[PDB]
Design a protein around this ligand. Structure first.
Ligand SMILES: CC(=O)N[C@@H]1[C@@H](O)[C@H](O[C@@H]2O[C@H](CO)[C@H](O)[C@H](O)[C@H]2O[C@@H]2O[C@@H](C)[C@@H](O)[C@@H](O)[C@@H]2O)[C@@H](CO)O[C@H]1O
Ligand SMILES: CC(=O)N[C@@H]1[C@@H](O)[C@H](O[C@@H]2O[C@H](CO)[C@H](O)[C@H](O)[C@H]2O[C@@H]2O[C@@H](C)[C@@H](O)[C@@H](O)[C@@H]2O)[C@@H](CO)O[C@H]1O
Ligand SMILES: CC(=O)N[C@@H]1[C@@H](O)[C@H](O[C@@H]2O[C@H](CO)[C@H](O)[C@H](O)[C@H]2O[C@@H]2O[C@@H](C)[C@@H](O)[C@@H](O)[C@@H]2O)[C@@H](CO)O[C@H]1O
Ligand SMILES: CC(=O)N[C@@H]1[C@@H](O)[C@H](O[C@@H]2O[C@H](CO)[C@H](O)[C@H](O)[C@H]2O[C@@H]2O[C@@H](C)[C@@H](O)[C@@H](O)[C@@H]2O)[C@@H](CO)O[C@H]1O
Ligand SMILES: CC(=O)N[C@@H]1[C@@H](O)[C@H](O[C@@H]2O[C@H](CO)[C@H](O)[C@H](O)[C@H]2O[C@@H]2O[C@@H](C)[C@@H](O)[C@@H](O)[C@@H]2O)[C@@H](CO)O[C@H]1O
Ligand SMILES: C[C@@H]1O[C@@H](O)[C@@H](O)[C@H](O)[C@@H]1O
Lengths: 87, 87, 87
């Protein structure tokens, strides 16, 4: 089991991505209780980073399985495959 | 052996968390010397994130031992166990 | 394969570091296409963190190989080994 953690804002909001058995899942905190997030994608290894544009959070998750990394993008309207390619 | 790194402030401060032998230790930089920090807890995988309220640094460390992740919290006066649970 | 991801600014700029086949390479996004960065060092594990000084980025990459971690520094003018020592 392996995790990546990101946070933003003043509350703050926190996201923790966990890779286990080639699935990555997400736990979220937005100032109250922890809840299971909408992120669900394949991966044995995960890293993540985020930034704010004004009030909007943008997240990028790098999900690696085998020898292959897929970027997954949150920009406010669902998780979408990003343009990242590796070496 | 596996690490996690955070930073904050204009100096900046840096914390590096290392998981080896199912212990996680902490090396710190506050502008001067590297030094071993107050943090340690069990874990063989580690992620971390942090934010400022000014004023005070706040650090969350996610220590995974086997199939369980524990959150450990720095909010300016000691490490305390966080409300995080997994799936 | 294992990755670490950092980002800065509003474009944003992203760097993703990937340890694979016992070496760590870098993929870079500055607002258009992805490209392969100058970071290249030995290691089985990588973590990283960054901060801005105005619009100048500073990156610290912690490359681990065996029971030892080497810190690598970007401060505008190439990569330089940093003062980090482990336990
Ligand atoms: C109290 C409050 O305002 N909470 C906000 C949340 O509702 C936002 O979570 C996102 O909310 C939308 C509906 O508005 C939808 O439910 C999304 O699934 C949910 O997204 C979560 O957070 C994302 C950043 C991703 O991590 C995603 O996988 C999660 O499920 C959040 C985020 O904008 O803001 C809170 O303030
Ligand atoms: C400032 C900011 O966060 N802007 C957001 C863009 O980054 C988002 O994605 C980019 O959208 C264009 C066309 O809409 C194109 O599809 C790019 O590939 C896409 O880039 C993504 O994000 C980059 C940061 C990289 O992660 C790249 O690999 C990704 O593919 C758009 C969503 O359309 O939202 C803006 O708000
Ligand atoms: C100039 C100076 O004193 N530097 C400050 C540090 O000493 C502070 O570190 C904390 O110091 C207290 C002693 O009063 C104690 O030893 C804490 O363990 C130490 O905390 C460190 O930093 C925290 C963020 C955690 O990483 C903790 O585990 C570390 O051990 C720091 C922050 O309190 O401020 C400097 O200015
Ligand atoms: C904005 C900020 O930095 N606030 C700090 C809180 O984050 C710290 O913990 C949270 O404290 C409130 C009680 O005042 C509440 O009890 C939350 O459960 C507690 O949550 C922790 O922190 C969250 C961000 C998550 O990491 C959560 O799982 C943790 O358990 C308090 C410490 O007493 O300090 C505030 O300054
Ligand atoms: C289009 C544009 O102007 N992009 C800039 C990049 O060229 C800069 O990156 C680097 O460029 C120099 C030569 O100009 C050299 O090739 C550097 O190695 C390269 O640095 C990259 O980015 C760094 C932050 C590191 O991640 C490094 O390992 C990378 O290879 C960047 C520098 O920030 O600025 C863009 O605007
Ligand atoms: C912020 C500092 O930058 C350089 O001076 C490094 O040698 C230190 O280890 C630290 O990363």
């Amino acid at each position: 089991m392996q995790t990546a953690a990101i946070s933003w804002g003043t509350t703050p909001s926190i996201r923790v991505y966990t890779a286990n058995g080639n699935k990555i899942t997400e736990r979220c905190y937005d100032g109250s209780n922890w809840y299971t997030g909408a992120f669900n994608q394949a991966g044995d290894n995960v890293s993540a980073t985020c930034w704010l544009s004004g009030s909007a959070v943008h997240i990028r998750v790098y999900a690696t399985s085998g020898g292959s990394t897929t970027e997954w993008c949150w920009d406010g309207d669902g998780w979408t495959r990003g343009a990242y390619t590796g070496l």
